[PDB]
């Protein structure tokens, strides 16, 4: 489908943003864990 081929960059970008925010959130949660240990 040409529709899916044209939207594939959009889907890849959406997944990249999703992974970026998820990794950032996990990084942040580990930082709060260290803060609580302190």
């Amino acid at each position: 489908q040409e529709l899916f081929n044209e939207l594939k960059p959009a889907v890849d970008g959406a997944n990249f943003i999703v992974n970026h925010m998820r990794d950032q959130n996990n990084y942040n949660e580990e930082k709060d864990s260290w803060n609580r240990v302190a």
Binding site: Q1, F4, L7, V11, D12, N15, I17, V18, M21, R22
Partner: peptide, 22 residues
């Protein structure tokens, strides 16, 4: 298009960003 795994992952991810920000 909805049945594709990538689209489902993207939709769940957008919902995840929304709930996390809330």
């Amino acid at each position: 298009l909805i049945k594709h795994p990538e689209v489902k992952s993207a939709i769940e991810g957008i919902k995840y960003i929304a709930e996390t920000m809330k």
